[PDB]
Design a protein around this ligand. Structure first.
Ligand SMILES: [Fe+3]
Ligand SMILES: [Fe+3]
Ligand SMILES: [Fe+3]
Ligand SMILES: [Fe+3]
Lengths: 310, 310, 310, 310
């Protein structure tokens, strides 16, 4: 089935101390999150750049991570229902608060965790280059050679285009129809590894460290998280649902050149350009496309999505 | 059929003199070992690191071999019966003792050679990236497309997870049932190249240089092995069988990232986590996972195991 | 009386960060351990080398600690009964787990805590070079000039030979008889400071961080130990008793030269060589002798052993 | 059909001037040689090392070309009949002599051109890594999936083992039977790209610059080849046929590691070792195995050999 996505967004310092926190805190958060049975996987990203679109953002590059002082992280977690994510944060609040405060001396902005519903998904199983013989052998034996997916390599060997779209009130049905048609047109592009369309349905309060006045002061006052705040919030997740409607267009590409000319088909390929013009006529903001590197992954979330493994 | 494994374990210095002994003594030992008809192959490893499991062993890294003063070597030899290995060491004792003493000025600990029985094996044929066209062509012509194995590249192009498990008395049947189910669950992980479960059944006395009192003094007294000790031991191999039962969980991965997130499924994937919880409830020691690099290989041992070549 | 010994074995990184943990965590562990009345003292060691025995381990030296990337630590604790050690770990589990996890980012292997019974002991009171006038004055006034011990200087001013022996089933009575006679023969060697023979009787589960499946996951998931695992183990200490029988032959020497030629009397002194030949005829593994430096000590454990102080 | 091979052997200096002669003279020689219709292709090699076989030639390495002062070149030309090669050299003698004398200030030994008959051949079509989709698609459409060859990459992306064997008089039938069985056993080795067995049938006089006394003096006297010697020789090619019989065992491997452990199966794999023991019992000289790099190739000679292209 289609899972629900929580996207944890943080800005951290770009220094060697922070990349130690990728391997010493990141796995522990995933292990605490995996105590809940509704957890079906994760995909963690570091922003490496921005699609400039010619000179529209000409100060930005697709690979600019070596020059930035701060790193944007997008940590996806996938859930059977979005209430499973809110139940996970409440039941594991002491362990998760203490782990998140280990990243405190690196954190610049955040955490901010909007919740998303998957509107459309074409996301294949992640395979290494050593695994494609198993993949095409199983699909040929099942008579499904026409549905053999591309080789989507896990753990930092592909790039993600993170496309932010804010759609005018009343034009959400027109966005979703033609953004789907745009992503089906990307299937012809070389290096396209798959795509999904995410629709924001709320913001997690506990994942965003948004408590009431007593809880907010206990966050500021605690020594390394030993003094755990009482996890009382003033809102639940659908009460912070941003209007007008936010959409993420998430597409995966084998490299940044395939991303630049593949996504560029909405500008340079005239048949795809008329399709994406209907998307552009619904937007109050966007498109702004961040380039992400999926470092740490829980690739079995695509096994839940595609209802098939290996 | 399933062969028996002798695992020769030595600690040697990490210096350029030692890596000359890989190419000037290592092949000679394999050639003396191949005088016996029960010898079916070998697989030689160098430990390159330890799986840290978050911060459980936080001073350890998966790739730490450039910083270590000493190298752990695990030299597997594969045998039609474990008595063939003990017969080989007795019949070729003078040549093997002299070759092992060429590594003497580098050796820090060892040699220690426990003998193992293969409980479970899913170990495919080793193929290069130039050989997969032959592999999928032969399996399609035989109507076995569903059993096409992953590309397991020989000679240092993959990594080995060496998982040490000591199982409580009486819980060996529960370990073997659910460690098998854990290794079948690894088939879904990207970059999984195969696995086997080894059960310790004894320790070779001649392979461990364990003689009686007269033989031990002749080992210390000899000049470069020219004075060969009489190979009289005080025990045979099943008389040194460690209780409680030692198990090796040997899994092969395309790279260390595939190893870290693949083996990590027993911590972060909730369906595999319940399976491996039954493994953890049988352990008096472990799991401790070393990361090994298979440098020198006798890959035809998998032809004996899978009863098929090419 | 003869106390029981728990030997905590860890491998840590050899870096200046680790030697800060000797003085900032080590004393706190000893202070938590001293809450129990059955605690009678401690002796903490760092491995500085290996006895090479000619060229048997020729890559090893007696003083090689300046070149090693990792340090082996042997932390002895002495107990009136071995159940007092298991009762101490359960009652002080939260404080001890949190202190042990301060060493986590340095730890490579371990912790592993086998429990030992003292078979034989000739271990004198530790005296400084300023204290021998008190020692010989008290022994002359008591008419015990014939039992005046050697000056065994505490706190890093002597070396320890850590002799590992694994004895065949049924030959444990022959080992203990002639290993005692070997240690009485060491009394004639210059620089011999005393010796004891330790017999492994079990492995502490809490001291080895060996919990059940829920406890093991809480060890991996916790942030610096603030989230304390429930200390439920699947075994008690005599249920992990290694067969065949492990022995430690622990001897103390004034320097490494006295150690090398003193222990070498089992090879070069013909009267002691026939005695130790009966020890060698019982061994399935060994002898392997590590060289240890006793840095931090609780020297009053010898006051309990010898039933006399000063 | 099976072509005939002329192998031009020269020793040249290892300097940057010589590698200019690879690209400025080498192609011109191939273009003059292609004037004859019996020319079916070429394969030019540079020796990069020697198989040491443990310490049998321990001063030699498989990759030692960066340290050598001189380069051995083996330039294969393939012919429909060996008389076509002798007819080519006589008809194009002025152009070929002038091109060969452009390499004169680099040449140390040679040229020496023995002629060979192909006894056995398993030499697939050369394909790039971009061409395997065409190769497996054509073989599946023709119902020949069982005979899909390995990917043999042209132009320096594989290595050649050049195995010299001199066989006793009367044992040539025993050599050819079991050297064929050895090369069929190499089909199981990883990275084996194919093999052929060459039998020396003569030495080309014009290709070896072996003229009569007047022609030899005109070779020494000429200014850059403008003064062309009269190509009168004292012998034809079967009159210089070396006795006892020379054989080349030519095998191709994806890399030097695949070569070392693949060819090593005649020493370490006991089933192949008994086969190659019958080869060794026919040899008065050898085996001596040079490691060659096939830089410049005329890969369409395998299209003539396998009677099929693409
Ligand atoms: Fe969350
Ligand atoms: Fe062995
Ligand atoms: Fe303890
Ligand atoms: Fe020629």
């Amino acid at each position: 089935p289609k899972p629900y996505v929580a996207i944890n967004m943080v800005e951290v310092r770009n220094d060697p101390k922070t990349l130690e926190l990728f391997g010493k805190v990141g796995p522990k958060v995933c292990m605490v999150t995996a105590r809940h049975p509704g957890f079906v996987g994760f995909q963690n990203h570091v922003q490496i750049g921005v699609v400039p679109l010619g000179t529209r953002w000409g100060g930005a590059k697709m690979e600019m991570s070596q020059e930035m002082h701060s790193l944007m992280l997008m940590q996806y977690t996938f859930w059977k229902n979005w209430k499973d994510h809110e139940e996970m944060h409440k039941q594991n609040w002491a362990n998760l608060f203490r782990l998140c405060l280990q990243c405190a001396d690196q954190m610049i902005w955040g955490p901010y965790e909007p919740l998303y519903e998957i509107v459309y998904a074409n996301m294949p199983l992640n395979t290494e280059m050593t695994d494609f013989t198993v993949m095409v052998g199983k699909k040929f034996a099942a008579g499904e050679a026409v549905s053999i997916p591309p080789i989507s390599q896990p753990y930092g060997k592909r790039v993600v285009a993170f496309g932010e779209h804010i759609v005018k009130e009343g034009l959400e049905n027109q966005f979703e129809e033609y953004a789907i048609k745009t992503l089906e047109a990307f299937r012809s592009a070389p290096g396209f590894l798959g795509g999904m369309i995410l629709k924001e349905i709320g913001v997690s309060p506990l994942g965003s460290l948004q408590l009431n006045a007593k809880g907010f002061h206990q966050i500021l006052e605690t020594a390394n998280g030993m003094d755990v705040p009482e996890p009382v919030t003033i809102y639940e997740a659908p009460e912070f649902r941003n209007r007008p409607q936010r959409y993420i267009v998430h597409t995966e590409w084998s490299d940044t050149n395939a991303l630049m000319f593949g996504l560029g088909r909405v500008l340079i390929y005239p048949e795809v350009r008329q399709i994406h013009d209907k998307v552009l006529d619904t937007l109050v903001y966007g498109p702004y496309i961040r380039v992400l590197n999926p470092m740490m992954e829980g690739t079995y979330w695509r096994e839940y999505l595609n209802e098939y493994h290996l």
